Amino acid sequence: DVMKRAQGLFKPIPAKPPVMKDNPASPSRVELGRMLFFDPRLSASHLISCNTCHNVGLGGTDILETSIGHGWQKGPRNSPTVLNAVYNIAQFWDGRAEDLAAQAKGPVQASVEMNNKPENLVATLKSIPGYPPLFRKAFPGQGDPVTFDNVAKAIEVFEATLVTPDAPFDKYLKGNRKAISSTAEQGLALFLDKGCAACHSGVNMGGTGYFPFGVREDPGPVVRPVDDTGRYKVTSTAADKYVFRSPSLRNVAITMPYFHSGKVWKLKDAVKIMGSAQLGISITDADADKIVTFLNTLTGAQPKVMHPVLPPNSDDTPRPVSN
Amino acid sequence: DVMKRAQGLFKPIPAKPPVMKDNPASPSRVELGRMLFFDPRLSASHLISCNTCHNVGLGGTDILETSIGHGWQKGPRNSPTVLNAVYNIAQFWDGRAEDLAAQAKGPVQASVEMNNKPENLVATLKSIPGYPPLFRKAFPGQGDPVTFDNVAKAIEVFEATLVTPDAPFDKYLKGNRKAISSTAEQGLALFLDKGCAACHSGVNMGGTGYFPFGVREDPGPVVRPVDDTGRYKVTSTAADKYVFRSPSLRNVAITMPYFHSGKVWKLKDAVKIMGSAQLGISITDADADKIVTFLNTLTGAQPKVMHPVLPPNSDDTPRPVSN
Ligand code: HEC
Ligand code: HEC
Ligand code: HEC
Ligand code: HEC
Ligand SMILES: [Ca+2]
Ligand SMILES: [Ca+2]
Known part of the structure; x- marks a missing residue:
């Protein structure tokens, strides 16, 4: 389940x-x-x-x-x-x-x-x-x-x-199946099945480690400005170029715009860009809508x-x- | 009394x-x-x-x-x-x-x-x-x-x-003589006797009418910038040149700097400038200190x-x- x-x-x-x-x-x-x-x-x-x-x-x-x-x-x-x-x-x-x-x-x-x-x-x-x-x-x-x-x-x-305790998703994690909608639960299944939880896991839904922004595809020079090489500036290690800490997705629906560049205003666009850039998939508009409905359940008190x-x-x- | x-x-x-x-x-x-x-x-x-x-x-x-x-x-x-x-x-x-x-x-x-x-x-x-x-x-x-x-x-x-109810001076006005110090009461007597209450009276200790900033002496072009003619810009009436609303003195001890130009940082300097500019007197440093002790009793909750x-x-x- x-x-x-x-x-x-x-x-x-x-x-x-x-x-x-x-x-x-x-x-x-x-x-x-x-x-x-x-x-x-x-x-x-x-x-x-x-x-x-x-x-x-x-x-x-x-x-x-x-x-x-x-x-x-x-x-x-x-x-x-x-x-x-x-x-x-x-x-x-x-x-x-x-x-x-x-x-x-x-x-x-x-x-x-x-x-x-x-x-x-x-x-x-x-x-x-x-x-x-x-x-x-x-x-x-x-x-x-x-x-x-x-x-x-x-x-x-x-x-x-x-x-921010007590988001609806946290009530679901504590065993209340009805705390999120069926559409949110389908977004959660899509989040899991596409691989997003590898980098957005744990108590904070992210904040867990360092990953390239663009594992599979360059997000391009607007969403990923070329001069901002992320952790490379911290370590001088070439394997850290364009590496950033994954964000916590708690309260993501209310913290627009998105990414470290702030260039993506719509959460559904950020989800599609994550599917392309990180996972090499084209998330459909219907699947992206269910994932956004799931991310909205991460807004806590x-x-x-x-x-x-x-x-x-x-x-x-x-x-x-x-x- | x-x-x-x-x-x-x-x-x-x-x-x-x-x-x-x-x-x-x-x-x-x-x-x-x-x-x-x-x-x-x-x-x-x-x-x-x-x-x-x-x-x-x-x-x-x-x-x-x-x-x-x-x-x-x-x-x-x-x-x-x-x-x-x-x-x-x-x-x-x-x-x-x-x-x-x-x-x-x-x-x-x-x-x-x-x-x-x-x-x-x-x-x-x-x-x-x-x-x-x-x-x-x-x-x-x-x-x-x-x-x-x-x-x-x-x-x-x-x-x-x-x-901001409940300043010590308001407790004094309600009949608690001990709510302000003897030195504050001497500042209050000086405020009254020098004429300051003509323009700073009522429920708000000011905010009651329009007066020239400089009834007796020009405060000079730093404290009274020449281009800011006050109510003259509102009415085009020559008798309103350099006329400003008196401020409420409630909470004056915590709202520095002072005057509409913001050029006077110390409340004791503002008191001396009010004595010169408005009343044509040179308030002594000891009298100005007692008046400032009184104005400090106007800070409310x-x-x-x-x-x-x-x-x-x-x-x-x-x-x-x-x-
Ligand atoms: C706007 C001009 C800022 C002010 C003032 C403060 N912060 Fe900030 N904060 C700002 C940015 C643009 C960033 C990211 C910078 C980067 O190089 O990554 C931050 C980051 C933080 C964080 C990190 C959160 C995380 O990594 O998830 C925290 C905890 C934070 N800021 C706290 C913070 C505090 C306590 C401030 C006052 C002393 C403060 N910030 C001021 C922008 C600005
Ligand atoms: C690790 C390889 C990741 C996978 C797989 C996915 N995400 Fe991710 N995400 C990751 C990083 C390193 C970052 C920050 C990139 C940056 O430089 O800005 C992100 C960011 C997001 C965001 C934006 C959140 C915010 O700006 O506060 C969202 C909404 C997001 N990620 C969602 C998400 C989804 C739905 C994923 C599966 C399709 C997914 N991510 C995968 C790292 C990784
Ligand atoms: C700083 C950039 C300001 C912002 C933002 C707001 N206010 Fe302001 N306020 C500011 C100044 C410099 C002045 C005096 C201007 C003048 O020509 O006299 C004011 C004045 C007020 C007042 C009048 C108080 C009185 O006369 O005793 C009030 C009640 C006031 N401001 C309220 C107010 C509100 C509600 C604001 C947001 C909508 C607001 N101000 C923003 C400076 C600035
Ligand atoms: C009317 C003729 C006044 C008399 C007499 C006194 N004051 Fe006054 N005061 C008056 C005005 C019109 C203004 C504002 C002038 C401006 O353009 O800025 C003031 C201002 C003060 C202030 C500054 C308060 C603040 O900036 O919020 C103080 C501290 C002050 N006045 C004190 C004061 C004292 C102690 C007086 C007797 C010595 C006095 N004022 C007389 C108008 C009049
Ligand atoms: Ca953001
Ligand atoms: Ca002030």
């Missing part, structure tokens, strides 16, 4: 946030991470926060082809969702960061994203009187707790709470996040830098 | 949101307005929402000298707080919009702010399947409820909930807003425009 086959390849998202080794999630550290995720003072301009590009109301992404950051500069890649990102084997589309705490240091410093630097960020947080007390509560064994590393750890334990009330500047807070 | 004098000039913010005539606040219409306030699809770029420039975590402002909108374009004016704006006599620093619903049509259309147009906004909301149902619930007697006017009305009844979960695009949703 397709339910039993699925139960051998995928797992539901747990209700409880996962534990980060060597980063305990106290109430104070998670609260601090939620404040920092929404605080645009993490950026040089004081205008961009993590929620700008990973909007918790829009599936943890920004619904753009590629992100726009400091100075209205467009980046090379589509912003992947923060939802469930804690269950991926590594972070970024090329897997270059080992975990969420390592990842968070990237956007802060990237000139086309937040355009900040660690020293300015620490000075800024130290100048906001309400922040050092919260760092002391969250990192109480440190003489100097307001550090870049601690910013990254706080944001990690907050992001570990941004999981969206987190319900209170927007933080952030502590005010002092007169010594650094002034925004917008150039 | 200074408490009795204050009770004759100011009033505390009511706990209940005020009623908007001809815009009833049903649960559905207020919920819709909260979704729209946080939805960056109100902008051409799909990246800017009202919360970008009126951040509910940062006192309802953006803590910049002047706002930056579409294309990284800097505007001429500092963003005033949305908190308590429902109690001002008119909206914008020049009072050119009669109420919050009229005001909301401005940022949507301004090329240096959201850079949208009404027809594109309506088409975009109609293309997001979850939005027309919510407009029907909020505006049930209309055959075509997804309109620009209705967007503005929904956002108005949401903004009428963004009031900050609203606790759940970030909305916004309905996803369809494949017919217009794609972002970033140029």
Whole structure:
């Protein structure tokens, strides 16, 4: 039976946030991470926060082809969702960061994203009187707790709470056959039988390893821009050219556009391109429609996040830098 | 007694949101307005929402000298707080919009702010399947409820909930003498005795009328940029040159920088400039410090807003425009 086959390849998202080794999630550290995720003072301009590009109301992404950051500069890649990102084997589309705490240091410093630097960020947080007390509560064994590393750890334990349990497919995996429609179940059988679960398996429906984008056919220079060689830039290993981490397909129906280039807006087109590029098949329009109906059952409960009330500047807070 | 004098000039913010005539606040219409306030699809770029420039975590402002909108374009004016704006006599620093619903049509259309147009906004909301149902619930007697006017009305009844009761000064006005410090009470006596309450009175501590910025002395061409003649641009009446609405001073300690130009970062400097420019006095540093201690008692309870979960695009949703 397709339910039993699925139960051998995928797992539901747990209700409880996962534990980060060597980063305990106290109430104070998670609260601090939620404040920092929404605080645009993490950026040089004081205008961009993590929620700008990973909007918790829009599936943890920004619904753009590629992100726009400091100075209205467009980046090379589509912003992947923060939802469930804690269950991926590594972070970024090329897997270059080992975990969420390592990842968070990237956007802060990237000139086309937040355009900040660690020293300015620490000075800024130290100048906001309400922040050092919260760092002391969250990192109480440190003489100097307001550090870049601690910013990254706080944001990690907050992001570990941004999981989306209870999608209809997870209720199916727990044994409720009626939680998805017959057409969704036929999409699930097509997903399994065409081979998609090789690269999109486990608790996260993906995020499990590194694969060429174009195992069987080049997706072409729009969907796969030639200069973006993926993990090759990370490892300098020729076998990594055009290799990317598979994405988690959880919440894919609400995180358009698709692929690391953001050039494919319709989920049905992304499914057909995956069949061609990865599997050398031409998926029919009727089969692609059933697979999309199945992928729509992977949208989980969206987190319900209170927007933080952030502590005010002092007169010594650094002034925004917008150039 | 200074408490009795204050009770004759100011009033505390009511706990209940005020009623908007001809815009009833049903649960559905207020919920819709909260979704729209946080939805960056109100902008051409799909990246800017009202919360970008009126951040509910940062006192309802953006803590910049002047706002930056579409294309990284800097505007001429500092963003005033949305908190308590429902109690001002008119909206914008020049009072050119009669109420919050009229005001909301401005940022949507301004090329240096959201850079949208009404027809594109309506088409975009109609293309997001979850939005027309919510407009029907909020505006049930209309055959075509997804309109620009209705967007503005929904956002108005949401903004009428963004009031900040329970500041320490309001507890003092209700008869608790100990709710503010002796030094704050001395600041209050100085505020009254120097004449500041003529222009900063009532329920909102301001927002009550139109006054020259520079009754007694020109603040100079940095703090009062010469090309920004305030209400003169609205009325073409020469007596309105450099006339601006007085701001509400509620939450002023957390809404820096100050004045419509955003050029004065320190509240103590703004107090001294008000004494010179408006009253022809040189406030001493000790008196300015007591007045700032009093203004700090005007920070009320900050609203606790759940970030909305916004309905996803369809494949017919217009794609972002970033140029
Ligand atoms: C827009 C200008 C961004 C801002 C601000 C932040 N992020 Fe981001 N994020 C962005 C892009 C374009 C990408 C992909 C880049 C690449 O080279 O692959 C990312 C990636 C992430 C991830 C990885 C998720 C995954 O691999 O599945 C995470 C967890 C993430 N971003 C988190 C994050 C945080 C915490 C931020 C504030 C400190 C932040 N991002 C800002 C775009 C932008
Ligand atoms: C491994 C060899 C894969 C197989 C087989 C399939 N997919 Fe895949 N998928 C894979 C990668 C490495 C990526 C990212 C490629 C990139 O550079 O962007 C993807 C991406 C998708 C997406 C887009 C998701 C998103 O952008 O967030 C979808 C919708 C998707 N894959 C679906 C899918 C289906 C339905 C498949 C069977 C027909 C399939 N994939 C096979 C790796 C692999
Ligand atoms: C930044 C790019 C802005 C965006 C996006 C929005 N607003 Fe704004 N707002 C901005 C400025 C610079 C100003 C002052 C302009 C002037 O000419 O005076 C405003 C003003 C307001 C007000 C008036 C408050 C008062 O007079 O006390 C309100 C109520 C307001 N803005 C609300 C608002 C809403 C609801 C928005 C989304 C539709 C919105 N603003 C976007 C800067 C920017
Ligand atoms: C009317 C004649 C006024 C008197 C007397 C005082 N103020 Fe005022 N104030 C007034 C206006 C019209 C404005 C806005 C001017 C502009 O173009 O920007 C202000 C502004 C302030 C501010 C800044 C608040 C903010 O930017 O949100 C403060 C802190 C302020 N006023 C304080 C203040 C004090 C302490 C006064 C007595 C010494 C005083 N004001 C008098 C109009 C008038
Ligand atoms: Ca995407
Ligand atoms: Ca201000």
